[PDB]
Design a binder for these strands. Structure first.
Lengths: 46, 98, 88
RNA sequence: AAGGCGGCCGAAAGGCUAGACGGUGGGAGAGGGUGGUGGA
RNA sequence: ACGCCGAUGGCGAAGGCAGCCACCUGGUCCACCCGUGACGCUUU
C-alpha cells in the first residue's frame, strides 16, 4: 500500500529516490506518504 | 460525518497512570467533538528518525473515527494543548493504494 | 459542501413532473442554491477573488436561463421568478 | 449594459437532438481562500 | 529558502500557483444516457 504512511519497513526502501521502479502515478503518491511519515518523525528528512 | 485517521505521538517517559490519563483525555476530546471511534491502534514506543522533544523515541497512537468535517480542526487544536502531546496529525481516511 | 440529499430537496420542489431533473426551472433553482451558498462563503473570505469570479459567472448563467424561459415560455418564467423570490 | 456568429427539419411559427446546461456515478490537479503545524 | 520527489508533469482567465494537515470554495475531465430542449459562442 503506497498510502500507508507508517510502514517504515517498506517506505525505508525508497529513501526521495527518483523514478525506485515506481511509475509516474505511483511516485508522488509515494512521496506524500513519505512526507507524512517524516513529520511523524517515522522517516528522516536528512 | 467523515472518516479520518488521528495519529498521535505522546511523550514516551510517562507512567501507567499519566499515560492512562492522557488517553482518557484524548477520548473525551474525540467524544466531545462528535467523533465515534471505529478502531484504535497503539504501537507505542518507536525508535523515531530525528529528535522530537529531545527524546529519540515516542509513543505512537492512532484511532480511526467518524466525525463532522467541520470539527476536525477544532479537535486537533484540542489534542495539541497537552504538554505530553508533541505531535498530532489528522488525515482524511483513504482506501489503500495497491 | 452541498449534499445530494439537500439537492434533491430542491429538485422535487421545482420539478415540472416526477423525474424532471434538468428543466430550466430546476436548473435555475439549483444554481440559486449554489449562488446562495457561494455568496455566504464569500461573505467571509473577501480575498478569494478566483472563486468570486465563479460567482459572477454563475449569476450570469442564471440570467441567461431566465431570459430564455421568459422568452420561450412566459408562462413558466411567471411562477419561477416568483417561487424563487428572485428578481425584484 | 449596445453588436455580430450559431447544428437538423420548417416559408414561418415552431419542432429536434448531436451543442449547452442539469441529474447520477467516477477521475486528476502547486486553481483560490481560512485555520494550523513541520523543517531548513 | 520551504530540499529530495519535480518531469519533454499539473492547475488557472490573465498575473501566476510547490513542505504537510484540515476546512471553505471556483474551474475541468470520462461514463450513462436519465432530464430541459439550441438555453450556445463572442466583440467593445
Amino acid at each position: 500500500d503506497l498510502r500507508d504512511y507508517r510502514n517504515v519497513e517498506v517506505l525505508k526502501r525508497f529513501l526521495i529516490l527518483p523514478r525506485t521502479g515506481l511509475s509516474g502515478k505511483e511516485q508522488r503518491i509515494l512521496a506524500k506518504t513519505i512526507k507524512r511519515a517524516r513529520i511523524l518523525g517515522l522517516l528522516p528528512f536528512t | 460525518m467523515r472518516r479520518y485517521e488521528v495519529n498521535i505521538v505522546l511523550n514516551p517517559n510517562l507512567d501507567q497512570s499519566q499515560l492512562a490519563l492522557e488517553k482518557e483525555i484524548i477520548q473525551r476530546a474525540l467524544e466531545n467533538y462528535g467523533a465515534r471511534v471505529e478502531k484504535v491502534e497503539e504501537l507505542g514506543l518507536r525508535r523515531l528518525a530525528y529528535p522530537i522533544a529531545k527524546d529519540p523515541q515516542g509513543y505512537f497512537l492512532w484511532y480511526q473515527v467518524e466525525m463532522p468535517e467541520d470539527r476536525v480542526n477544532d479537535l486537533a487544536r484540542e489534542l495539541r494543548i497537552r504538554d505530553n502531546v508533541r505531535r498530532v496529525m489528522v488525515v482524511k481516511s483513504q482506501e489503500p493504494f495497491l | 459542501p452541498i449534499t445530494k440529499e439537500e439537492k434533491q430537496k430542491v429538485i422535487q420542489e421545482f420539478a415540472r413532473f416526477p423525474g424532471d431533473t434538468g428543466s430550466t426551472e430546476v436548473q435555475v433553482a439549483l444554481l440559486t442554491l449554489r449562488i446562495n451558498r457561494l455568496s455566504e462563503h464569500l461573505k467571509v473570505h473577501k480575498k478569494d477573488h478566483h472563486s468570486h469570479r465563479g460567482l459572477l459567472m454563475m449569476v450570469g448563467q442564471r440570467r441567461r436561463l431566465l431570459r430564455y424561459l421568459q422568452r420561450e415560455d412566459p408562462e413558466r418564467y411567471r411562477e419561477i421568478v416568483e417561487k424563487l423570490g428572485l428578481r425584484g
